Amino acid sequence: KIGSVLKQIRQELNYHQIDLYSGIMSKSVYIKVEADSRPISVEELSKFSERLGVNFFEILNRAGMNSVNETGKEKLLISKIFTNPDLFDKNFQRIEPKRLTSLQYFSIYLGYISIAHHYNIEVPTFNKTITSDLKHLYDKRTTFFGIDYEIVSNLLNVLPYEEVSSIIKPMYPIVDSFGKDYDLTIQTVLKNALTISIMNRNLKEAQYYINQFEHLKTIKNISINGYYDLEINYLKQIYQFLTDKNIDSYLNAVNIINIFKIIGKEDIHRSLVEELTKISAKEKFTPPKEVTMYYENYVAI
């Protein structure tokens, strides 16, 4: 872990053991730290971190913090259980019971309920406990962490918008950034939410999400996800088309879909194309020959 990494970085930058502990601990003590035979304090690592000049978060990662613990494992097992709907059964029975052990397990658990509805496996349990679970986790909350946003994102995918919208309102506006991981999670929710909104032609909720996202940009140090910014901006375009049948807005939307293709985002392109097709279909309006030609051969697969 840490200790090794410190000795490594220390020597790389050509610092003697002395430059690191000089005014932080004993040589007898510091040797124990590099030997990985004495836990280092968060505050201590921090000082060494500065002395060396290498970022604290980097040192941690360079020492193994990354899917490196009980819950970490349980989470990886879903990308696999996805591509093997039979490796399900034995796993859904060990998790289901402990789905409220911590917020992280509720996420994972919802991850299975997703894989379920997908391949169409059975989950009669989900229908008779989702409401009980939610109340137990979001009835008396005053603060939300990354994991809560991750959870709401999973919920949106396995639950009718009506059942999840109540949970969301209390989680925005965001006023601070608590890391890049946190920044990403709080943004995913807005994207998912907005997409669904635009899809139910629920313009009032759409505007709300579009606005929450515009707000995030003003937050000091927040790391906006470019792909998201580009997709939400596409949704903002459709939003204007639904509001005043603006033609430029429709063009801007088609245009952004093409950009996603031009930069190699096959997945997002397919999604945004099928998305645009349906929307127009409802508006009783035909999309360009371009987009439709893509839809077909995305059905021929």
Add this chain to the structure above:
Amino acid sequence: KIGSVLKQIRQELNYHQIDLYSGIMSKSVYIKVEADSRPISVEELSKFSERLGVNFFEILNRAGMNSVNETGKEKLLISKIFTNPDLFDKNFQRIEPKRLTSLQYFSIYLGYISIAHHYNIEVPTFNKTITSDLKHLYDKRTTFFGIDYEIVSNLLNVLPYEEVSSIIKPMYPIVDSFGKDYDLTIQTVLKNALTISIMNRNLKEAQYYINQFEHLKTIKNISINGYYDLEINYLKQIYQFLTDKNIDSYLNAVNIINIFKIIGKEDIHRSLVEELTKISAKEKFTPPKEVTMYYENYVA
């Protein structure tokens, strides 16, 4: 610090001290942790976070890690001096002599050299020691850390490419992801180097960086910056225009440039609009009316 946040998160989620300290430490000690009268260890805070179910890094950020030490305070000061150049001279006379204390300081140092070149200020010692400093910092180096990528990105901003490329080559390709923070840095060097390359019409170097970025996209657990991906693709489109004058590649570029305006990234758009006007000139080509419409209004 940490303890406060730990307790705060614990109660928010309705847990008892038992649920946390059990199997890790005595209830007697866990009280000192939540009181911050005892320093917690990286090993412990990790178990506690796993228990709480909240991101380890998020807890640390909430606990204040985000600026604190003198190195960070000095970093913030840069942009201050940037807005008010009058702060330069005095602060520079404090940093300059410490530029080799640490990689963080050398970066900050290169920061002033940037502010200076912008306000035509004179920094005579730079030219007198830049080559020596770089030779002293990167000759016995074998592996590189995030900070080095930040440094290289800076060098490209205050030094002629030729004096940097050699420091840049042994730093790629990237093999592992070491956190979103580190991910973003190794990406920036490519964008800045690729940009300078396309500008100098150095096609060989340009395609090298283009491939290095593409390689990152294959690394497990790497956060690709969407904005960069969209800008590098534009440099890639320009790359093709310069290679074999393709009218469509020129269109595509113009197209991405316009997307940067629609989604509201005004500064990248200003940037790219000048970049195209200058590239088109060297190629004896007239950019679209639209592009120069923006360039001209921007310059004012």
Add this chain to the structure above:
Amino acid sequence: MFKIGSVLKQIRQELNYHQIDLYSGIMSKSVYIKVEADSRPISVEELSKFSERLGVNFFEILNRAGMNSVNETGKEKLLISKIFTNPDLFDKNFQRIEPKRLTSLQYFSIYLGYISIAHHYNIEVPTFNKTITSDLKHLYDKRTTFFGIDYEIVSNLLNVLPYEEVSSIIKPMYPIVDSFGKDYDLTIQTVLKNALTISIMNRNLKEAQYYINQFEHLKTIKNISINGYYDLEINYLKQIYQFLTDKNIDSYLNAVNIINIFKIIGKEDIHRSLVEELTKISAKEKFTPPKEVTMYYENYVAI
């Protein structure tokens, strides 16, 4: 009236021919001289022959002689343009025309010119509505074949009459089966374009396609000379028709693109006309025209 002889002499000498070359086998030297002196009538037959000898097109010679005017009817038709700029002349003039509005199909066309002006400079011509309907019946109930002038008359009517009243008169004049010259082609085409503009305007999709078809039919006629500008504008009205029929985003795009070509090639007045059209067409459909075309229209109205 026409100076055909002088024109002949002008061409004959420019091409370095001698009189014998022209008259031999057609007339005596004595008479050929009277012909060039413009002191002896020349037949269509003879002129056609001198035309073959000279090698210059018969129509051009007549044109060079002045077939573009020299007669009472032409002067009246010319006088209209004046009255438009200076309307005080309307009255005393409209008192001469009106009573002769049926003398020939030409005078009737002129007559409608006046009725058009009057409408513009808000003048009141009560006699018009008092007789127009009786007039048109008198002019078209016993008809079987239609000439170029009848198509001009129809375009005039579309300008000073509700569509429904002019519509019945048009129908029996189509489809066209044969061309009778560039002059005739242009007229049978203008009716279609003007009628189609009005169709699409009243969102009358079935009438609209009628004309669109009539037009496209003209393209299959031997030696028909399709007016390129019309072909473009009518294809714009075709793109609109398709949008109004099933809201095609591409169809709307085409319409906008064609509107742009008119700007690129410099056809100012038509570009103004179309930008104004699309702006109204669109509103009715609860759509907003592109920012582009709205900037133009708003700027044109700014005069």
Add this chain to the structure above:
Amino acid sequence: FKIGSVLKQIRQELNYHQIDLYSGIMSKSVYIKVEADSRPISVEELSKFSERLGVNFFEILNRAGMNSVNETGKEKLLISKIFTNPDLFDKNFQRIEPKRLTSLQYFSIYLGYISIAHHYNIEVPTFNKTITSDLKHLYDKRTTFFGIDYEIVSNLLNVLPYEEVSSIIKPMYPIVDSFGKDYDLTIQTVLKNALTISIMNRNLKEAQYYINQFEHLKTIKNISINGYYDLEINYLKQIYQFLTDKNIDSYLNAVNIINIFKIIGKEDIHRSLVEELTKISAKEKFTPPKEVTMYYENYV
């Protein structure tokens, strides 16, 4: 030349009596004669009946059959049969070639055969031998030109190197008056064809010349401009701006205009503009859009 019956046809159609036509122009027995086609009618007389019937003088003539009438007409018509039946070339060329200077019409027809001949790569050695003396003989003492002169020039441009015609063209422009729709078309064709050639050979100085001559036409009273030509000549104008300073906007306008030609159905012009855009591009070591190279390739 059955003008008398056509007057009868029209006179009755418009429900007019014989007295409505001859009252003030001629006697009754003479007019009777006229409609019977038993007495030639003078241009003046015909212009008068025309005003009484209210129907176009030129329309009445076309309705009477001026659409053919004489030997020169037959010879012109025969050029289509031969263009699609080369085996018919030799018999008629032996007849035409010798009459090529009989009149300007015949010289035009003659040029028609030389075009056909070049197309089917047929031998016509008498041409290369007498073409120059011919031009000299027909255009040395010329001061003013007529329609057939512009027709002849279009012909010359099609079977002769540009450099041998340019000099005969210059004296025929600018045009000052219009002399009917037939004439107006002819004069525009020369410009359109000549500008096409100039743009190809990349002769910019001359290209501008034809572009300006066309522009002047628009300022002429009663001139009937050809929409298709206007659109196509403007296309060449855009290509002109492109060759002059590689203006990207100009290039895109060219492509857009090529598209319009397809959108409205002019399959032949489109096929033509598609080819030259490809050849013109290739020369400039420039590649056209995927769009137009597609159409071109599939046009073989």
